[PDB]
Design an enzyme around this catalytic site. Structure first.
Site, PDB file in Angstrom:
ATOM      1  N   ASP B  22       0.840  -1.212   0.000  1.00 25.36           N
ATOM      2  CA  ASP B  22       0.000   0.000   0.000  1.00 25.36           C
ATOM      3  C   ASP B  22       0.870   1.254   0.000  1.00 25.36           C
ATOM      4  O   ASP B  22       0.463   2.256  -0.612  1.00 25.36           O
ATOM      5  CB  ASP B  22      -0.924  -0.033   1.212  1.00 25.36           C
ATOM      6  CG  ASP B  22      -1.691   1.252   1.403  1.00 25.36           C
ATOM      7  OD1 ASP B  22      -2.564   1.539   0.563  1.00 25.36           O
ATOM      8  OD2 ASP B  22      -1.399   1.963   2.386  1.00 25.36           O
ATOM      9  N   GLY B  23       2.037   1.197   0.641  1.00 27.28           N
ATOM     10  CA  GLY B  23       2.912   2.368   0.761  1.00 27.28           C
ATOM     11  C   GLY B  23       2.225   3.464   1.544  1.00 27.28           C
ATOM     12  O   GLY B  23       1.767   3.207   2.666  1.00 27.28           O
ATOM     13  N   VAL B  68       3.228  -8.677   4.537  1.00 26.92           N
ATOM     14  CA  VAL B  68       2.294  -9.296   3.567  1.00 26.92           C
ATOM     15  C   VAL B  68       2.423 -10.818   3.663  1.00 26.92           C
ATOM     16  O   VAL B  68       1.416 -11.517   3.456  1.00 26.92           O
ATOM     17  CB  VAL B  68       2.549  -8.765   2.143  1.00 26.92           C
ATOM     18  CG1 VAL B  68       3.925  -9.153   1.614  1.00 26.92           C
ATOM     19  CG2 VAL B  68       1.455  -9.201   1.185  1.00 26.92           C
ATOM     20  N   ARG B  69       3.607 -11.310   4.043  1.00 28.35           N
ATOM     21  CA  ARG B  69       3.900 -12.754   4.178  1.00 28.35           C
ATOM     22  C   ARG B  69       3.280 -13.315   5.458  1.00 28.35           C
ATOM     23  O   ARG B  69       3.406 -14.532   5.686  1.00 28.35           O
ATOM     24  CB  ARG B  69       5.412 -12.982   4.158  1.00 28.35           C
ATOM     25  CG  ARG B  69       6.052 -12.614   2.830  1.00 28.35           C
ATOM     26  CD  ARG B  69       7.555 -12.781   2.854  1.00 28.35           C
ATOM     27  NE  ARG B  69       8.200 -11.799   3.714  1.00 28.35           N
ATOM     28  CZ  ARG B  69       9.503 -11.772   3.981  1.00 28.35           C
ATOM     29  NH1 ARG B  69      10.310 -12.680   3.454  1.00 28.35           N
ATOM     30  NH2 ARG B  69       9.998 -10.837   4.776  1.00 28.35           N
ATOM     31  N   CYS B  91      10.475  -2.115  -7.117  1.00 28.06           N
ATOM     32  CA  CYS B  91      10.741  -1.905  -8.555  1.00 28.06           C
ATOM     33  C   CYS B  91      12.227  -1.796  -8.911  1.00 28.06           C
ATOM     34  O   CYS B  91      12.521  -1.855 -10.119  1.00 28.06           O
ATOM     35  CB  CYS B  91      10.028  -0.646  -9.032  1.00 28.06           C
ATOM     36  SG  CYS B  91      10.547   0.843  -8.143  1.00 28.06           S
ATOM     37  N   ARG B 260       9.189   5.908  -4.501  1.00 31.42           N
ATOM     38  CA  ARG B 260       8.524   4.592  -4.599  1.00 31.42           C
ATOM     39  C   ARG B 260       7.010   4.737  -4.753  1.00 31.42           C
ATOM     40  O   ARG B 260       6.355   3.715  -5.014  1.00 31.42           O
ATOM     41  CB  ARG B 260       8.865   3.746  -3.373  1.00 31.42           C
ATOM     42  CG  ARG B 260      10.356   3.450  -3.293  1.00 31.42           C
ATOM     43  CD  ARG B 260      10.746   2.510  -2.176  1.00 31.42           C
ATOM     44  NE  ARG B 260      10.414   1.126  -2.483  1.00 31.42           N
ATOM     45  CZ  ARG B 260      10.634   0.103  -1.663  1.00 31.42           C
ATOM     46  NH1 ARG B 260      11.187   0.305  -0.477  1.00 31.42           N
ATOM     47  NH2 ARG B 260      10.300  -1.122  -2.032  1.00 31.42           N
ATOM     48  N   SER B 261       6.461   5.942  -4.580  1.00 34.64           N
ATOM     49  CA  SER B 261       4.996   6.159  -4.558  1.00 34.64           C
ATOM     50  C   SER B 261       4.432   6.203  -5.981  1.00 34.64           C
ATOM     51  O   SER B 261       5.195   6.434  -6.938  1.00 34.64           O
ATOM     52  CB  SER B 261       4.635   7.417  -3.804  1.00 34.64           C
ATOM     53  OG  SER B 261       5.130   8.572  -4.466  1.00 34.64           O
ATOM     54  N   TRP B 262       3.118   5.999  -6.094  1.00 35.40           N
ATOM     55  CA  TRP B 262       2.378   6.057  -7.374  1.00 35.40           C
ATOM     56  C   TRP B 262       2.236   7.492  -7.863  1.00 35.40           C
ATOM     57  O   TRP B 262       2.181   8.421  -7.036  1.00 35.40           O
ATOM     58  CB  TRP B 262       0.985   5.449  -7.238  1.00 35.40           C
ATOM     59  CG  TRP B 262       0.950   3.961  -7.231  1.00 35.40           C
ATOM     60  CD1 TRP B 262       1.956   3.103  -7.557  1.00 35.40           C
ATOM     61  CD2 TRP B 262      -0.182   3.151  -6.894  1.00 35.40           C
ATOM     62  NE1 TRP B 262       1.527   1.808  -7.432  1.00 35.40           N
ATOM     63  CE2 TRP B 262       0.218   1.808  -7.030  1.00 35.40           C
ATOM     64  CE3 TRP B 262      -1.489   3.431  -6.487  1.00 35.40           C
ATOM     65  CZ2 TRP B 262      -0.646   0.748  -6.773  1.00 35.40           C
ATOM     66  CZ3 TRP B 262      -2.345   2.382  -6.235  1.00 35.40           C
ATOM     67  CH2 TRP B 262      -1.923   1.058  -6.378  1.00 35.40           C
TER      68      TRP B 262
HETATM   69  N1  LIG Z   1       8.110  -7.434   2.834  1.00 37.93           N
HETATM   70  C1  LIG Z   1       7.258  -6.413   2.815  1.00 37.93           C
HETATM   71  N2  LIG Z   1       6.034  -6.518   3.443  1.00 37.93           N
HETATM   72  C2  LIG Z   1       5.153  -5.455   3.419  1.00 37.93           C
HETATM   73  N3  LIG Z   1       5.496  -4.287   2.768  1.00 37.93           N
HETATM   74  C3  LIG Z   1       6.697  -4.176   2.150  1.00 37.93           C
HETATM   75  C4  LIG Z   1       7.594  -5.235   2.162  1.00 37.93           C
HETATM   76  N4  LIG Z   1       8.696  -4.854   1.478  1.00 37.93           N
HETATM   77  C5  LIG Z   1       8.516  -3.591   1.035  1.00 37.93           C
HETATM   78  N5  LIG Z   1       7.282  -3.157   1.443  1.00 37.93           N
HETATM   79  C6  LIG Z   1       6.689  -1.835   1.175  1.00 37.93           C
HETATM   80  O1  LIG Z   1       6.040  -1.840  -0.080  1.00 37.93           O
HETATM   81  C7  LIG Z   1       6.225  -0.601  -0.735  1.00 37.93           C
HETATM   82  C8  LIG Z   1       6.372  -0.808  -2.240  1.00 37.93           C
HETATM   83  S1  LIG Z   1       6.777   0.728  -3.108  1.00 37.93           S
HETATM   84  C9  LIG Z   1       5.046   0.964  -3.582  1.00 37.93           C
HETATM   85  C10 LIG Z   1       4.335   1.957  -2.669  1.00 37.93           C
HETATM   86  C11 LIG Z   1       2.881   2.255  -3.018  1.00 37.93           C
HETATM   87  N6  LIG Z   1       2.450   1.450  -4.155  1.00 37.93           N
HETATM   88  C12 LIG Z   1       2.705   3.746  -3.276  1.00 37.93           C
HETATM   89  O2  LIG Z   1       2.293   4.160  -4.359  1.00 37.93           O
HETATM   90  O3  LIG Z   1       2.967   4.572  -2.402  1.00 37.93           O
HETATM   91  C13 LIG Z   1       7.459   0.041  -0.128  1.00 37.93           C
HETATM   92  O4  LIG Z   1       7.192   1.376   0.229  1.00 37.93           O
HETATM   93  C14 LIG Z   1       7.779  -0.780   1.104  1.00 37.93           C
HETATM   94  O5  LIG Z   1       7.746   0.034   2.252  1.00 37.93           O
END
Ligand SMILES: Nc1ncnc2c1ncn2[C@@H]1O[C@H](CSCC[C@H](N)C(=O)O)[C@@H](O)[C@H]1O
Ligand SMILES: Nc1ncnc2c1ncn2[C@@H]1O[C@H](CSCC[C@H](N)C(=O)O)[C@@H](O)[C@H]1O
Ligand SMILES: [Zn+2]
Ligand SMILES: [Zn+2]
Ligand SMILES: [Zn+2]
Lengths: 417, 281
Positions: B22-23, B68-69, B91, B260-262
């Site tokens: 979700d970020g 998430v795991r 990414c 890293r955000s959308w």
């Molecule tokens: N193992 C994990 N479990 C849960 N979240 C994680 C993770 N590894 C990385 N992340 C999170 O997932 C995000 C992916 S970057 C995407 C952020 C989001 N889509 C937005 O637009 O803001 C990163 O910010 C990181 O903090």
């Protein structure tokens, strides 16, 4: 020793407690003690000015509230109280061994807080806040509305341009807003938040009377000099005459340059700020130089922060008691965000981490500190500045609703939106 | 091919959204901006800086899990059916321009498969014709075999959408999903900012017309070469201003989060026809 022997004659009904100076046992009783029953000598009055509102890094008072000295003090357990009582005074005015009896009491309330009013030979008068209030306390006519003009404001040691933000919140039309600053972060804040309208000068020590004259007349001169070298709680302090303390004199100069001459009756107002923790000689010299007595205004009345500051100035009605407005946030809990809980009810900046979040001791958030000090939210989020820099910037800044209280009658003297 | 018919307005209900990786909770903010009633918004994330953002900006409404795991099909089932699943996996283990990259099956690349699993678990079974939608994001610059493997797994070809047309940023991204009419060309709205100069604050001048994130300091300030500001970068990426100013996180950390955000108006474009499928405020 001699004072202790005298108090013997006080309790033997041979001397009236009101006829002796309960601080140091001097016979030169002139004033009465504002907090408790007894007299006060002039020397102790000066000490009482310095020491009452001095707080240490633990958020408790630096010295005893009674004698304003003492080597070992007793801290207060009760909520929101910051006072301390030195062992010696307690072992005289209350009774012998009462101090060590208070040491052994794990849930202890100090005598300023406890529900009962009588405590041995020590008696507390209930009118002590009002007496304390009065203890610490060329007039231009009103200008008719059609004749009113936009305000011109010089702000020296401007910081984050709090004064312009307050005048905008009050809806006063600002022709120009010239600001002296040297910290890059603080320079950035004003530019962004006020859209380039702020004329940034630089070092205040480059500002001449010629500059002030060619920048057009000023209607309001405001400022707060650095307090690091004035505040007595800094051991390494250099005083009013060394280090960064002397920038106040530059403020005094440019105020003198900006003030209208005699016979020119155009409206002009000024506001200077400093910390309550300033020395007797320092405070006296400043009070003499600004040709006025300071008004002491505490932020706790309208700003949910324990921030007692001296305000020199000639703003009309600046003695009148602070009347809170519904917009203002009188509670620290009314400033934190959801899921966070305030330890205390007021923050202390002249427990170290005043946040309970998820059963853990968290530090204060910068934005929550912004809301406490009355700034519109995200005011200092302009550039890529460190948390340390934003903290320092908010720390040195003015309490917004206090400045709104002081600036409030200026609405009757300049043009409003 | 399973395309859902339009639901009539009186039958429409609040959307239930699962947002994995979700970020900074961009998806909930865009749905709110579009005025869709949000029943619930569950979010997996592990970095404290990002965790705080959603909490503050959305008033505790977001149900945080964590790893998430740690999210099982049982968890997904007891959290009730979801109406919209969205996400973007890390990414810069996919991007070819990082020499030390581990690709798609190694390092942090493999984090997408958790999202793929929970999306499948959250998807309605065959014969259950209740509306359900998904959106997955990634960087254009990934390996050709990587892009192929993702295209095989998600049973669709990616749409390539560049942010610069609607967001004044060079952020060309692949979007997998089954949103209706998601192929249609990008439209511009007057609210959106198409010029970098428009995003900048007063007294600053844009060297270029579009920023490059997949001169290094593209700002002219006081006849000096300045770096990008986070608040200007927010205005570039389509977020409401001061969105990430929630906790005591470093300017470096806020840069990492916004990087890293959308891109907001690109996600808004893809989310737009959901207004014809769920209840309005
Ligand atoms: N193992 C994990 N479990 C849960 N979240 C994680 C993770 N590894 C990385 N992340 C999170 O997932 C995000 C992916 S970057 C995407 C952020 C989001 N889509 C937005 O637009 O803001 C990163 O910010 C990181 O903090
Ligand atoms: N020599 C100097 N010339 C100009 N400004 C100075 C200075 N020395 C210190 N300052 C600035 O003056 C400020 C005084 S602290 C007061 C800040 C201001 N009253 C506010 O409300 O924000 C400090 O922030 C410091 O950055
Ligand atoms: Zn005395
Ligand atoms: Zn004492
Ligand atoms: Zn007390």
């Amino acid at each position: 020793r001699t004072r202790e022997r005298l108090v013997y004659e006080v309790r033997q009904k041979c001397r009236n407690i009101e006829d002796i100076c309960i601080s140091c046992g001097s016979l030169n009783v002139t004033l009465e003690h504002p907090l408790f029953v007894g007299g006060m000598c002039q020397n102790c009055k000066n000490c009482f000015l310095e020491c009452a509102y001095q707080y240490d890094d633990d958020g408790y008072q630096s010295y005893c509230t009674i004698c304003c000295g003492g080597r070992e003090v007793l801290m207060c357990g009760n909520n929101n109280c910051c006072r301390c009582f030195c062992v010696e005074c307690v072992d005289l005015l209350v009774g012998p061994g009462a101090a060590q009896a208070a040491i052994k009491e794990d849930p202890w309330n100090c005598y300023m807080c406890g529900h009962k009013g009588t405590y041995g030979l020590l008696r507390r008068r209930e009118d002590w806040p009002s007496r304390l209030q009065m203890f610490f306390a060329k007039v231009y006519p009103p200008v008719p509305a059609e004749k009113r003009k936009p305000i011109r404001v010089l702000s020296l040691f401007d910081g984050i341009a709090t004064g312009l933000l307050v005048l905008k919140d009050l809806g006063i039309q600002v022709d120009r807003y010239i600001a002296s600053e040297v910290c890059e972060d603080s320079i950035t804040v004003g530019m962004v938040r006020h859209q380039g309208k702020i004329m940034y000068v630089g070092d205040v020590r480059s500002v001449t009377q010629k500059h002030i004259q060619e920048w057009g007349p000023f209607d309001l001169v405001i400022g707060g000099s650095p307090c690091n070298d004035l505040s007595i709680v800094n051991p390494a302090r250099k005083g009013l005459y060394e280090g960064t303390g002397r920038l106040f004199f530059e403020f005094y100069r440019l105020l003198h340059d900006a003030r209208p001459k005699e016979g020119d009756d155009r409206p002009f107002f000024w506001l200077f700020e400093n910390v309550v923790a300033m020395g007797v000689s320092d405070k006296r010299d400043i009070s003499r130089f600004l040709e006025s007595n300071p008004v002491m205004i505490d932020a706790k009345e309208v700003s949910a922060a324990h921030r007692a500051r001296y305000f020199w100035g000639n703003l009309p009605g600046m003695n009148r008691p602070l009347a809170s407005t519904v917009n203002d946030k009188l509670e620290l809990q009314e400033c934190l965000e959801h899921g966070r809980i305030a330890k205390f009810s007021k923050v202390r900046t002249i427990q170290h981490f005043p946040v309970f979040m998820n059963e853990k001791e968290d530090i204060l958030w910068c934005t929550e500190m912004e809301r406490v000090f009355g700034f519109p939210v995200h005011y200092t989020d302009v550039s890529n500045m460190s948390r340390l820099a934003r903290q320092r910037l908010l720390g040195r800044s003015w309490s917004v609703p206090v400045i709104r209280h002081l600036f409030a009658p200026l609405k009757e003297y300049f043009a409003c939106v």
